[PDB]
């Protein structure tokens, strides 16, 4: 029923303490409303636990994201919209790890350059809400780090013990993804046989067979000539969790720096990116690579201010700007943002989020996304970058290794009536096994010279 | 000399095919431009699947002919 | 509803194209069988270059349409 | 004018001496008619010279040809019809080495398996003749190891000092090919850029561009994932040369064996393959991999007898049977040969020679070959093997890195009137730079699954 843990370390450098305290004294949107004394007790437990990631892996990610920023690699970021403790199981994790590897080999062939793989995993347990009371009149579900999905009042109370449950689930998952990435799942030939089974059994396989066959000949060629790292990420939302997981280490200049060891990279969402808020200030104090989500109310001028605050030393790949405009708005809204930022001399990664600007409620009462709109935003994103001569750096996608019925369309041609089949997401609709693979194939075509 | 006569026919069939392919691309463009001015997407996934499916009687190369016709109509992706 | 009308046209153009492609393959086969029974080669390199060249007005994809028509006529090589 | 060399070693094992003596006491067709005393003096010089090849390289070739025999690699053999001392220069050798490397990367991609590269080089200095008096009434030219190309009687006398000149030219050439194969010419990316320049400038480039582009994407993919041996061969024709270049070494069973160190592999031609003759018997005494040319008068029964005499220990890849039937005869004549040999349980390499069964004299007075007939024989060869379920193991082709005008057709559409432009071969017409590349592309299509 309950685990019991008793409460009964070296100080930070004086300047890092001052800066951390100042970041956390700024106002913060979307925080849990639990008591400060209970939060503090939970953070004290987390301050001594083994970290989810280590500094050397974060420094290595930074070097790989620098190549992406310079136009010599591509970033694939993907996973569940919301991880749940309930589905934090071996089959679910393996299914997502495999999906990401499958998409990555397809994208690598299309881009003709390395693909950096960042999973939404081992921490994606918190979400923001526009309304604190939902459609059933209950306090809103804010992810398993905060409260329960169950539609009852007791379940929806904010519960600080979920910080520690979140850590435990994150460690366990990350342990498995490390294991899985040094196993036979690694092998590029095994990973691509899955894609060819997908081509054989998919209703739209004829659309993708030529490209699947060409990839298979590239792999066999490589072998005829004599011839896996998955990073963890989540939205840095709950500051009690992120601050508890900070650790001091010597950074890429040999001086002690603060690393958030809850993940390798984190991003700041649309509702928490206040320029003078705690999330942006917290991002300025940590050594991790960071991303900021940019929606349709973004100005070129605010985008530059984010770049100058978050990438003050002009470190290629330290900052990612994640575009989510809507498929009908991206072609008009993005170019002015890109031009103004390019002119600063900084090298950010431009990443497309084709999911969050394109959501709508179906007549059957399910929030859903159409495949054609998702594809069209990624396409428009590539067009904006071709015209300006800039690098389309990656995609940020929400997916699952399960055959869910959540997003409309694809090869399966999922309808409004089919959405009830198994709509399993705890939050936003995921592209299923098939639809995620389809998009990787379509984006690989977009990447071709 | 049945070969010259038969090659004479293939020439006609190629002029005929070429002309229907040029036509199809212009019509394909006009459908894309109308949908886009009206706020719709560039491509329609389900419709491209219909187009692929109706060249399947040619065998394995049928889908590659359809995909090639789609490229002539709506262009290459991400361009 | 100009889209339905225009798509209605593309359907016709696809039925037209499909039928001329089936025809061309049958004629292509008959030229190959006549030449071979008479002791000649399976393929004629210079003639395939003429066929490729006369789809060049379609742009870069033109040669790939021609090569695909050649495969439907004389088959894949080494088979 | 002349180099001067004075004449003024351990005995073979008793059984190897007995067997060598017996092989050489058999009748031998197509031998030079120079005095025995002068031949002996020249062979004594060659018996102490550093060898052209070494035993360990021959044992390694055998292992690679075993894979070819088992259906897991492909053999490309090619070079000048006749090497001349006159053209044994750096540009000519480099041009041929590069042509072979260019064709090989194309074939490797098509076959989806390793390609073993064997050049007709560093020894292809002797040819047989059906007539001892040629069309000008002179004694026939028999290659630079025997006499001179020049149309005068003094030049056509058989000259035993050419055994030593042949060695000297062979060493020098082999030295350079070793150097060239460990240089930047090695790089697969450099080798394939030449093919793409060929595609860009060839009149028939549109025929090959899709495949060239697909290969380039395979190479870039290989590099995105984090990722040269040329063997010497010639027809073993002049027994004075081959016997002088024998050396004793421990073979693939640890017992002393005789290796012909004039090359890595040799073949026996149509006019010297008498089953009870010295060439076949000599081939039985050496440890090198061997090939036998099979023309349209070959019976399935004689083919088996060659296999049983030459591959008595059932060593995959030790024997190659080189088919040259004519494009109009290969489909009918080859299947019975292949079926009878497959049924013995031996694993020979089946190699296509599309050149020698397809030669004709043009109206302008030049011996020439049509490209369409060469392509058609290779094609028919593949069809024979598809139908029987056997492995089409390779091709044996005659080529040059120069833009010669010797074979009719190709992208350039070389005519009878164009053959006079620069017909440079000392013997049979070679496929030029462009036509050799074209055939590699066409054969790569034939190899596709
Ligand atoms: O909706 C359409 O009909 C048009 C034509 C098109 C084609 O080329 O056939 C088919 C489907 C769409 O992706 C594009 C291309 O727009
Ligand atoms: O000679 C010919 O005309 C026929 C027809 C063919 C074609 O498909 O067009 C063209 C050239 C040849 O290689 C083959 C295929 O034979
Ligand atoms: Mn989401
Ligand atoms: Mn020859």
Swiss-Prot record, chains A, D:
GO terms, biological process: amino acid biosynthetic process; aromatic amino acid family biosynthetic process; chorismate biosynthetic process; protein homooligomerization
Complex formation: Homodimer. Interacts with Rv0948c.
UniProt-annotated binding residues for phosphoenolpyruvate: 120, 270-271, 293, 324
GO MF terms held by the record: 3-deoxy-7-phosphoheptulonate synthase activity; manganese ion binding
Primary role: Catalyzes an aldol-like condensation reaction between phosphoenolpyruvate (PEP) and D-erythrose 4-phosphate (E4P) to generate 3-deoxy-D-arabino-heptulosonate 7-phosphate (DAH7P) and inorganic phosphate.
Lineage start: Bacteria, Bacillati, Actinomycetota, Actinomycetes, Mycobacteriales
Keywords, in A-Z order: Amino-acid biosynthesis, Aromatic amino acid biosynthesis, Cadmium, Cobalt, Manganese, Metal-binding, Transferase
Assigned GO CC terms: cytosol; peptidoglycan-based cell wall; plasma membrane
Cofactor binding mode and count: Binds 1 divalent cation per subunit. The enzyme is active with manganese, cobalt or cadmium ions.
EC number: 2.5.1.54
Reactions catalysed according to its record: D-erythrose 4-phosphate + phosphoenolpyruvate + H2O = 7-phospho-2-dehydro-3-deoxy-D-arabino-heptonate + phosphate
Pathway as given in its UniProt record: Metabolic intermediate biosynthesis; chorismate biosynthesis; chorismate from D-erythrose 4-phosphate and phosphoenolpyruvate: step 1/7
Sites where the protein binds Mn(2+): 81, 356, 398, 428
Pfam families: DAHP_synth_2
Protein name: Phospho-2-dehydro-3-deoxyheptonate aldolase AroG
UniProt record similarity statement: Belongs to the class-II DAHP synthase family.
Keyword Transferase: yes
Required cofactor(s): Mn(2+); Co(2+); Cd(2+)
Modes of activity regulation: Feedback inhibited by tryptophan, tyrosine, phenylalanine and chorismate.
From Swiss-Prot, chains B, C:
Activity control, per UniProt: The formation of the complex with AroG activates the chorismate mutase activity by more than two orders of magnitude to a catalytic efficiency (kcat/Km) typical for chorismate mutase. This activation is primarily caused by a more than 30-fold-decreased Km value, but also by a four-fold increase in kcat. The activity of the complex is inhibited by phenylalanine and tyrosine by about 70 and 40%, respectively.
EC id: 5.4.99.5
Compartments it resides in: Cytoplasm
UniProt binding sites for chorismate: 35, 44, 48
Feature type site, description Important for activation via AroG: 75-77
GO CC annotations on file: cytoplasm; plasma membrane
Enzyme class, first EC level, given as a word: isomerase
Main location: cytoplasm
Reaction(s) this enzyme catalyzes, per UniProt: chorismate = prephenate
Site (Important for catalysis): 35
Signal peptide: none
GO BP terms: amino acid biosynthetic process; aromatic amino acid family biosynthetic process, prephenate pathway; chorismate metabolic process; salicylic acid biosynthetic process
One GO molecular-function entry: chorismate mutase activity
Keyword Cytoplasm: yes
Cysteines engaged in disulfide bonds, as pairs: none
Residue ranges of domain Chorismate mutase in the record: 1-79
Keyword Cytoplasm appears in the UniProt entry: yes
Effect in UniProt of substituting residue 75 to A: The catalytic efficiency and the affinity are 5 and 3-fold lower than the wild-type. The activation by AroG is 10-fold lower than the wild-type
Keyword line: Amino-acid biosynthesis, Aromatic amino acid biosynthesis, Cytoplasm, Isomerase
Biological or metabolic pathway of the protein: Metabolic intermediate biosynthesis; prephenate biosynthesis; prephenate from chorismate: step 1/1
Subunit and interaction comment: Homodimer. Interacts with AroG.
Stated role: Catalyzes the Claisen rearrangement of chorismate to prephenate. Probably involved in the aromatic amino acid biosynthesis.
Protein name (database record): Intracellular chorismate mutase
Species: Mycobacterium tuberculosis (strain ATCC 25618 / H37Rv)
Range covered out of full length: 27 to 105 of 105
């Amino acid at each position: 029923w309950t685990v019991d843990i008793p409460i009964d370390l070296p100080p930070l450098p004086t300047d890092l303490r001052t800066r951390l305290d100042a970041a956390l004294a700024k106002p913060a949107a979307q925080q849990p409303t639990w008591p400060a004394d209970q939060a503090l007790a939970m953070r004290t437990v987390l301050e001594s636990v083994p970290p989810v990631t280590v500094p050397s892996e974060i420094v290595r990610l930074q070097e790989q994201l620098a190549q992406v920023a310079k136009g010599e690699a591509f970033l694939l970021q993907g996973g569940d919209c919301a991880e749940t403790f309930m589905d934090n199981t071996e089959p679910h994790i393996r299914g997502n790890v495999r999906a990401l590897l499958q998409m990555a080999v397809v994208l690598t062939y299309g881009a003709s350059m390395p693909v950096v793989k960042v999973a939404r995993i081992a921490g994606q347990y918190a979400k923001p809400r526009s309304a604190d009371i939902d459609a059933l009149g209950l306090r809103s579900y804010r992810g398993d780090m905060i409260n329960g999905f169950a539609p009852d009042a007791a379940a929806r109370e904010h519960d600080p013990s979920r910080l520690v449950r979140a850590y435990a689930n994150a460690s366990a998952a990350m342990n498995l993804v490390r294991a899985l990435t040094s196993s036979g799942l690694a092998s590029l030939h095994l990973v691509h046989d899955w894609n060819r089974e997908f081509v054989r059994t998919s209703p739209a396989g004829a659309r993708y067979e030529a490209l699947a066959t060409e990839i298979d000949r590239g792999l066999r060629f490589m072998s005829a000539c004599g011839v896996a790292e998955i990073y963890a990420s989540h939205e840095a939302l709950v500051l009690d969790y992120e601050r508890a997981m900070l650790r001091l280490s010597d950074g890429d200049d040999g001086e002690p720096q603060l690393f958030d060891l809850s993940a390798h990279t984190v991003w700041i969402g649309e509702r928490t990116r206040q320029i003078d808020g705690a999330h942006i200030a917290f991002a300025q104090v940590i050594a991790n690579p960071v991303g900021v989500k940019l929606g349709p109310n973004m100005t070129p001028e605010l985008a530059v201010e984010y770049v100058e605050r978050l990438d003050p030393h002009n470190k290629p790949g330290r900052l990612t700007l994640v575009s989510r405009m809507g498929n009908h708005k991206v072609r008009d809204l993005l170019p002015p943002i890109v031009e103004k930022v390019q002119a600063t001399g900084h090298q950010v990664i431009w990443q497309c989020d084709p999911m969050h600007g394109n959501t709508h409620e179906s007549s059957t009462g399910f929030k859903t996304r159409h495949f054609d709109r998702i594809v069209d935003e990624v396409q428009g994103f590539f067009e904006v970058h071709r015209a300006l001569g800039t690098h389309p750096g990656g995609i940020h996608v929400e997916i699952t290794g399960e055959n869910v019925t959540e997003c409309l369309g694809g090869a399966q041609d999922i309808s409004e009536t089919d959405l009830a089949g198994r709509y399993e997401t705890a939050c936003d609709p995921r592209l299923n096994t098939q639809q995620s693979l389809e998009l990787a194939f379509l984006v690989a075509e977009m990447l071709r010279d | 000399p049945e070969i010259d006569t038969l090659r004479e026919e293939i020439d006609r069939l190629d002029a005929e095919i070429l002309a229907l392919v040029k036509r199809r691309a212009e019509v394909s463009k006009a459908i894309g431009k109308a949908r886009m001015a009206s706020g719709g997407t560039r491509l329609v996934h389900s419709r491209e699947m219909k187009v692929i499916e109706r060249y399947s009687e040619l065998g394995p190369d049928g889908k590659d002919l359809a995909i090639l016709l789609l490229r002539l109509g709506r262009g290459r992706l991400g361009h």
